[PDB]
């Protein structure tokens, strides 16, 4: 069906490890979208064909306002192309670099949108496993959208592939290569809530080895300005034992969320 000839390419939207993402317009319809480009030599070297198939299969069947759409894909002997919904207000990562920290209303609103999208995902027993600011995009009304399903799977699961970059958003059971489930996403939600309020993630360190240590031991502290309600929620989510982490419904009904969020369940 689709081919590169069908699109006019425009400015670079971003770069990932494999992904090189461009603004693009479909020639016949003038439909504006995002084209994620992956090089076959790099995919083959890393041996990550299976993740790319998962990304397409999982994310193309999901339908939720707070999850980025994937429309299709094609390939052409040097490259693979994913056709994505364009997110015009960019990444949460960029927004955090701009403002340094988010206030409580902004934070509680993003956490609600995130928990809604995750609740929908978990109801199909899909776990995302790579929730972090560079993979959270913003729609035309500033609404949050989860993207980048390259690491997603069905629960329960072990890990069959190497952790490339940052450990900062992963739970103890994942970094120790143990069996894991849906609760991995709830831990990441806690890490994000902290980073939104404070400006950096709670286990951040100078080396991989010590970040690993802070995570496995759950060693984090709060700055004075973080309020009691925020502390209660973050402490509940960052539990070493997965079964002690709350359900997404309990997150959405937490008093601090309901007091500060501007969006409903
Ligand atoms: N649909 C989109 N709209 C706008 N920007 C995007 C979109 N998809 C990706 N980006 C930008 O490109 C970056 C890499 O995309 P991603 O799909 O996360 O690649 P990777 O799998 O390599 O991490 C994102 O962090 C973001 O900056
Ligand atoms: O040559 C390929 N390496 C890959 O990783 C791709 C897997 C294939 C594929 C099929 C469906 C969805 C996503 C990717 C297409 C062919 C290339
Ligand atoms: Mg990414
Ligand atoms: Mg990826």
Swiss-Prot record:
Tissue expression, as annotated, is:
Highly expressed in testis and weakly in skeletal muscle, thymus and spleen. Also highly expressed in colon, ovarian, prostate, neuroblastoma, breast and cervical cancer cell lines.
Q: Which residues bind ATP?
A: 17, 36, 85-87, 134-135, 148
Pinpoint the Protein kinase domain residues. Answer: 7-257
Active site residues per record = 130 (proton acceptor)
Q: Where the protein is mainly located, per its record?
A: cytoplasm
Annotated keywords: ATP-binding, Cell cycle, Cell division, Cell membrane, Cell projection, Cilium, Cilium biogenesis/degradation, Cytoplasm, Cytoskeleton, Isopeptide bond, Kinase, Membrane, Microtubule, Mitosis, Nucleotide-binding, Phosphoprotein, Proto-oncogene, Serine/threonine-protein kinase, Transferase, Ubl conjugation
Outcome following mutation: residue 29 to R: In a colorectal adenocarcinoma sample; somatic mutation; reduces interaction with TPX2
Q: How is it regulated at the activity level? A: Activation of CDK1, appears to be an upstream event of AURKA activation. Phosphatase inhibitor-2 (PPP1R2) and TPX2 act also as activators. Inactivated by the G2 checkpoint. Inhibited by GADD45A and p53/TP53, and through dephosphorylation by protein phosphatase type 1 (PP1). MLN8054 is also a potent and selective inhibitor. Activated during the early phase of cilia disassembly in the presence of CIMAP3. Inhibited by the small molecule inhibitor VX-680.
The consequence of residue 148 to N is: Abolishes cilia disassembly and kinase activity
**Chain positions of cross-link Glycyl lysine isopeptide (Lys-Gly) (interchain with G-Cter in SUMO2):** 132
How does this protein assemble?
A: Part of a complex composed of NEDD9, AURKA and CTTN; within the complex NEDD9 acts as a scaffold protein and is required for complex formation. Identified in a complex with AUNIP and NIN. Interacts with FBXL7. Interacts with CPEB1, JTB, TACC1, TPX2, PPP2CA, as well as with the protein phosphatase type 1 (PP1) isoforms PPP1CA, PPP1CB and PPP1CC. Also interacts with its substrates ARHGEF2, BORA, KIF2A, PARD3, and p53/TP53. Interaction with BORA promotes phosphorylation of PLK1. Interacts with CIMAP3. Interacts with GADD45A, competing with its oligomerization.
Which family, according to UniProt?
A: Belongs to the protein kinase superfamily. Ser/Thr protein kinase family. Aurora subfamily.
Q: What is this protein called?
A: Aurora kinase A
Provenance organism: Homo sapiens
Q: Which residues of the full protein are shown?
A: 127 to 391 of 403
């Amino acid at each position: 069906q689709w081919a590169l000839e069908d699109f006019e390419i425009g400015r670079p939207l971003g770069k990932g490890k494999f992904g090189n993402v461009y603004l693009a317009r479909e020639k016949q319809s003038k439909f504006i979208l995002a084209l994620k480009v992956l090089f076959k030599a790099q995919l083959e070297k890393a041996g990550v064909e299976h993740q790319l198939r998962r990304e397409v299969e999982i994310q193309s069947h999901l339908r939720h306002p707070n999850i980025l759409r994937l429309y299709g894909y094609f390939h052409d002997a040097t490259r693979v192309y994913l056709i994505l919904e364009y997110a015009p207000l960019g990444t949460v990562y960029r927004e955090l670099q701009k403002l340094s920290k988010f206030d409580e209303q902004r934070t509680a609103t993003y956490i609600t949108e995130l928990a809604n999208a995750l609740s929908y995902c978990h109801s199909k027993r899909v776990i995302h496993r790579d929730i972090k600011p560079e993979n959270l995009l913003l729609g035309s009304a500033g609404e949050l959208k989860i993207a980048d399903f390259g690491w997603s799977v069905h629960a329960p699961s072990s890990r069959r592939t190497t952790l490339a970059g940052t450990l900062d958003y992963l739970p103890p059971e994942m970094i120790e290569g143990r069996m894991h489930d849906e609760k991995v996403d709830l831990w990441s939600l806690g890490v994000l809530c902290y980073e939104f309020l404070v400006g950096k993630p709670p286990f951040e360190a100078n080396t991989y080895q010590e970040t690993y240590k802070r995570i496995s031991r759950v060693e984090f502290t709060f700055p004075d300005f973080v309020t009691e309600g925020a502390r209660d929620l973050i402490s509940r989510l960052l539990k070493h034992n997965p079964s002690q982490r709350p359900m997404l419904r309990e997150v959405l009904e937490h008093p601090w969320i309901t007091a500060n969020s501007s969006k409903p369940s």
